[PDB]
Amino acid sequence: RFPTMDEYTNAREELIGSEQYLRVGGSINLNNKEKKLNQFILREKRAIIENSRLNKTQYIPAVSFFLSKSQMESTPIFKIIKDMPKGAALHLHDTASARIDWIVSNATYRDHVYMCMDQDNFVRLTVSGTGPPANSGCEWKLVETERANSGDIAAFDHWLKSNISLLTTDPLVTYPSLDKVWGRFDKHFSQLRGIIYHTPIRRDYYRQILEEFRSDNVQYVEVRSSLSGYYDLDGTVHDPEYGLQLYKAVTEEFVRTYPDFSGAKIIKSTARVKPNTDIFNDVKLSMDLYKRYPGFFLGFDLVAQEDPNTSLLGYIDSLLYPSRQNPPVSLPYYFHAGETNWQGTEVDYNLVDALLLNATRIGHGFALIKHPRVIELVKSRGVAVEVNPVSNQLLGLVKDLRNHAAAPLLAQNVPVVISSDDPGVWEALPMSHDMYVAFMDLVGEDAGLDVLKQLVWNSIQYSSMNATEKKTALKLLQAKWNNFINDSLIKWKLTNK
């Protein structure tokens, strides 16, 4: 009943307003300084969207990261997000979270590093103190010699980087299927496995994760790591507790050096390709490290490609073992779950088992929007979904990022944290690229700084810090946020707006 345009406007704005309040960040009340920055962001967002829509050209924030990376980095919204404190990156893999450039310019300049071209014509890297490795399907050569004989060291080093990065070409073009791009992604890890498991390189690589994340204004990380098998020049192989202690010592020194950094905690990950009887041992291992490293060791996760490998149900007696002890042991789980386009299959039904197993957070949950009951359990229990949008695009779940299945989750205020997954593999920053695409593609044109602030706060509030640590971290984050707001008003000439 709209006799005049005012009654129609009022009902229209009431319904739209209800959705805006319901979505992520909708209950935030911005202060006056925040509002001025918010209005600039919203003007910028409308300008790029309206140009795409009305001038009938592609929306760059939603195309392949290969194409959009160099375009977004010059824009004001990206520069604001780059400067913004992120809080925490809660979904990361320890052999994929520092720069390939550091592997090349630092690790492959160390003594005793070898390279070979494998039968698929990819370079592999490893360390051997005890002579060159055996020619098992590839001929190892000392990198120092190959580089010194290249006749162009800059080109040699660039070739190493180009042969290892997944962003050398557009993966959506070069590996145009799920199985092809996962073939390339699995190959990347095989290329670096040898060098990245040598103990002093692994130690320093982990330190580089912390340096790079701090440099992108991330103050805290939770990292998945397999922990085991770091090896020395003399061939000594270390156990998982040693690997955990190695990370603990690096983290403590880093936080000593940088008290503006909250620190790190570690999740043990095992590949879901192994027999149940081996997963059982890794569950027992995790129960032990959880008891003896409280507050640094968080719990357990299963990784490797979800679709063709073993389901959570395929491991259910291992995963139920802690809860079944007398007295029960509660081993926290952080399951990767539902990282798939399938529906009604044992892959997306991993989400059901993740909830039945009391997962603390869920990795990806791309299939979650197809499961209305699992959504309601996730919301009612406060189980944060770790959303990694660049990863999901480049690794084959979606092409146009406005079709990312987390957008309907955010619209319902499902608890979500943004993370980068494997940023080093495809040359992403620790958080700013993923936060930009989440901001530009997974929420709407009228969604501004309140969404960003809520996602940032979510990454601490749904971290696995204890309550006291969260309060301390939020105090530090609030000071970072206030500086970011003031700096941004000056930088974007908004102060009198």
Ligand X SMILES: *[C@@H]1O[C@H](CO)[C@@H](O)[C@H](O)[C@H]1NC(C)=O
Ligand Y SMILES: *[C@@H]1O[C@H](CO)[C@@H](O[C@@]2(O)O[C@H](CO)[C@@H](O)[C@H](O)[C@H]2NC(C)=O)[C@H](O)[C@H]1NC(C)=O
Q: Which residues bind ligand Y (CB under 6 A)?
A: 121-122, 162-163, 168
222 included as an active-site residue: no
Q: Is 198 in the site for a copy of itself (CB under 8 A)?
A: no
Query: CA-CA distance, 439 to 407, in Å (whole number)?
Result: 10
Interface with Zn ion (CB under 5 A), residue total 1
> Judged by CB, which is closer to ligand Y: 165, or 217?
165
| Contact indicator for 363, 301 with CB cutoff of 8 Å | yes
Report H helices in 65-129.
65-72, 76-83, 100-105
Binding partner selected for residue 495 from a copy of itself, ligand X, ligand Y, none, CB under the kind-specific 5 to 8 Å limit: none
**Selected range binding a copy of itself among 58-66, 272-280, 466-474, 484-492, rule: CB under 8 A:** 58-66
Nearer CB in complex with a copy of itself: 142/356: 356
Question: Judged by CB under 8 A, which of 81, 246, 352, 452 binds a copy of itself?
Answer: 352
The residues, any chain, with a CB within 8 Å of residue 143's CB and separated by 6 or more, are 108, 109, 113, 114, 115, 125
The binder of ligand X chosen from 236, 281, 358, 483 (CB under 6 A):
358
Task: Report if residue 51 touches ligand X, rule: CB under 6 A.
Answer: yes
Active site residue 364: yes
Say which residues have a Cβ less than 8 Å from residue 83's Cβ, sequence separation at least 6.
217, 484, 487, 488, 491
324 binds a copy of itself (CB under 8 A): yes
Q: Which residues contact 402 (CB under 8 A, 6 or more apart)?
A: 59, 62, 441, 442
Specify the residue, 250 or 352, whose C-beta has the smaller distance to a copy of itself: 352
Indicate which of ligand Y, Zn ion, ligand X, none lies near residue 204 (CB less than 5 to 8 Å, by partner kind): ligand X
Indicate which single residue of 34, 306, 421, 450 sits in contact with Zn ion (rule: CB under 5 A). 421
Q: In what order do the strands lie in the sheet with 218-225?
A: 87-89, 218-225, 263-271, 297-303
- In contact, 196 and 103? CB cutoff 8 Å: yes
Residue 479 contact among a copy of itself, ligand X, Zn ion, none, beta carbon within 5 to 8 Å by kind: none
- Least CB distance from residue 37 to ligand X, whole Å? 22
Q: In what order do the strands lie in the sheet with 113-117?
A: 123-127, 113-117, 141-142
Distance CA 175, CA 177 (A): 6
Q: Buried (b) or exposed (e) across 106-124, using 16+ Cβ within 10 A?
A: ebbeeebbbbbeeeeebbb
- The span from the CA of 342 to the CA of 477, in Å, is 38
Q: Candidates 47-55, 147-155, 257-265, 363-371 — which segment interacts with ligand X by CB under 6 A?
A: 47-55
Residue (22 or 155) nearer to ligand Y, CB: 155
Among 4, 70, 119, 121, binds ligand X (CB under 6 A): 121
In DSSP terms, 143 is beta-bridged to none
Token duo for residue 316: 């259910």
Residues 188, 364, 404, 433: which is the catalytic one?
A: 364
Selected range binding a copy of itself among 146-154, 216-224, 271-279, 440-448, rule: CB under 8 A: 440-448
Pairing outcome for strands 87-89 and 218-225: parallel
Residues of the shown chain interacting with a copy of itself in the complex, contacts defined by CB under 8 A: 1-3, 5, 8, 11-12, 15-16, 18-19, 22, 49, 53-54, 56-59, 62, 177-179, 182, 307-308, 313, 316-317, 320, 323-324, 328, 341-345, 347-349, 352-353, 355-356, 369-374, 397-400, 402-403, 405, 407-408, 411-412, 443-447
Active site residues: 339, 364
Residues of the shown chain interacting with Zn ion in the complex, contacts defined by CB under 5 A: 421
